[PDB]
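Dissemination and training. As part of the outreach component of the grant, students in the summer workshop were shown how a complex can be specified as a set of sequence lines and then modelled as a single object. The example used during the hands-on session is reproduced here so that future cohorts can follow it. Participants entered these lines:
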Amino acid sequence: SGPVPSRARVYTDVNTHRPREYWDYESHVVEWGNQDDYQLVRKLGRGKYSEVFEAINITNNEKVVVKILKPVKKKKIKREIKILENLRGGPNIITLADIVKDPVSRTPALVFEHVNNTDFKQLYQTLTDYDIRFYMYEILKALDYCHSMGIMHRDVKPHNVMIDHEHRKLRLIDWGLAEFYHPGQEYNVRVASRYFKGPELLVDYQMYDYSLDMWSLGCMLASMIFRKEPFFHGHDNYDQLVRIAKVLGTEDLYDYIDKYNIELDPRFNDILGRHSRKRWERFVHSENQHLVSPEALDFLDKLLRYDHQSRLTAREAMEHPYFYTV
Ligand SMILES: Nc1ncnc2c1ncn2[C@@H]1O[C@H](COP(=O)(O)OP(=O)(O)O)[C@@H](O)[C@H]1O
Ligand SMILES: Nc1ncnc2c1ncn2[C@@H]1O[C@H](COP(=O)(O)OP(=O)(O)O)[C@@H](O)[C@H]1O
Ligand SMILES: [Mg+2]
Ligand SMILES: [Mg+2]
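and obtained this result:
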């Protein structure tokens, strides 16, 4: 009767052993600071859930970033704040410096340490083989940390990874979609961003875990080493699974949905087709051959697996021969 349950193979019961206050974010009380301490410089951009501004902390001449959340639900604002405070000081985790009430949109505003990022469209075309490995290892430190802390980032992608290349400093930012992992909990599948959505999301499998972030990381690695942005370029959430099945094959996809007793949307019957897993050498060309190695391909192979339980964990990934050179 319905899908088969699943649980993370690591850090399974971290949250149950911690005080209620750690994961029960709804009860958190915000200690509001003074908004007028930060002078807004310019709008960095607008997404569906926030407006981010470059700002100056006028007490110390330090550059900061101010994230002003769009209305949403009180529960979500406390969740991002709680996760940010629980992870504060962790390896390569962005530091929440302050919290203020915004006067224009009476919604709360998060103040962060500024990172001198470069648009990924430009930065990634300039990364060497060594650089990809170095930064991948830095992202893995953050993911292993947040997973060890019982938290799934759930939105791993280039716009959510700040890289100050000149100083070789990487921070994992945007904990807005992050959530506490509780074994057996059925989560909302409308998470991550299209090209980085795991097959568990695409097939509507709700009992997912930290391993979703490992699929997302794999998508980032494939785009970097093959110089193909994004690697799985779906037109929509249905075509997204089709793009994946053209690379990973359909037989392993059907075994995955068989294993978890998933009812695949009948809309896929006419579009998935029949595909065999491609050898990674198919995506290698003269212009990306310098970023590819047998270690890179093996590592990518171990992340990009339909079965979320079969993907390398962040700790296993950090042990991979791909990082022996770093
Ligand atoms: N600490 C930071 N330093 C520099 N730029 C940042 C920082 N935090 C966010 N940004 C920029 O603002 C954007 C939006 O921030 P983010 O937290 O991802 O918001 P959202 O949840 O709305 O996507 C980022 O993608 C990046 O371009
Ligand atoms: N990048 C995002 N940042 C914040 N909220 C998002 C983002 N993408 C989607 N959402 C919204 O949040 C929902 C998923 O959030 P979540 O808290 O996990 O689910 P639920 O509220 O059902 O428990 C989506 O259905 C959508 O409304
Ligand atoms: Mg973001
Ligand atoms: Mg976000």
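Residues 171 and 297 are 25 Å apart (CA to CA). Students were then asked to discuss how this feature might be tested experimentally.
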